[PDB]
Ligand binder design. Structure first.
Ligand SMILES: N=C(N)c1ccc(NCc2ncc(-c3ccccc3)[nH]2)cc1OCc1cccnc1
Length: 222
């Protein structure tokens, strides 16, 4: 996450850190004590989910760890175009909820109003390093027509765009699968965007969570 700052340690209880090979790979969102929602491009072997993390460089009293039982990628995910970039992870152990570990409710309304949003993650910052402390930024939803011109032929109905025209606040590598929060609801998941990270010119592209209500329900009930 570029051009942001450290989060208030009590503001992100839904945030998950996804590790493979001992390093941070992706973010994720706790949506149910047994499930974390992330991007399908985060599928890697032996994912380890960390809940209640703020600083990755220190052992915290709030942190919980879980292996993944199964990873459920959306049947229509297209890695070439990033279309339907969503995956459900079933936790081996139900998340022990606290004031620092809580699920985030999903936005089910695709017409939903709220344009003022926020992003968070442990992805690459402006200096190019991977921060130990989670980063936050307030960003705004970018209209469908405007995102379509930034990335011609690349934006589907399963994607939402968001960014910051003023300073370029944007998600980055490592933020993938993290949340786009609008009106205290999960509106999107970090999917892709511009290279290098920064949304001054072209906005960040997010998986449109409202489109997956049925599939998320059906997966959780399976
Ligand atoms: N600028 C952004 N808002 C942004 C946010 C997240 C990501 N995630 C990386 C990522 N998305 C999709 C894939 C992927 C999919 C299929 C197969 C292999 C890989 N990888 C990338 C972003 O911008 C591009 C970018 C690329 C590399 C380094 N920095 C930024």
């Amino acid at each position: 996450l570029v051009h942001g700052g450290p989060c208030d340690k009590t503001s992100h209880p839904y945030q998950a850190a996804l590790y493979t090979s001992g390093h941070l790979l992706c973010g994720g969102v706790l949506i149910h004590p047994l499930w974390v929602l992330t991007a399908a491009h985060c599928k890697k072997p032996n994912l380890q989910v960390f809940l209640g993390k703020h600083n990755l460089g220190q052992q915290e009293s709030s942190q919980e760890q879980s292996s993944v039982v199964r990873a459920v990628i959306h049947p229509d995910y297209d890695a070439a175009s990033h279309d339907q970039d969503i995956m459900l992870l079933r936790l081996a152990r139900p998340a022990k909820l606290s004031e620092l570990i809580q699920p985030l409710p999903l936005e089910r309304d695709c017409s939903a109003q709220t344009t003022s949003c926020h992003i968070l993650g442990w992805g690459k910052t402006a200096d190019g390093d991977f921060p130990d402390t989670i980063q936050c930024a307030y960003i705004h939803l970018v209209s469908r027509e405007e995102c379509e011109h930034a990335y011609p032929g690349q934006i589907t109905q399963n994607m939402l765009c968001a960014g910051d025209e003023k300073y370029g606040k944007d998600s980055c590598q490592g933020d993938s699968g993290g949340p786009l929060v609008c009106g205290d609801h999960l509106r999107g998941l970090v999917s892709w965007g511009d290279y290098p990270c920064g949304s001054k010119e072209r906005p960040g592209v997010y998986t449109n969570v409202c489109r997956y209500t049925n599939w998320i329900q059906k997966t959780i009930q399976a």
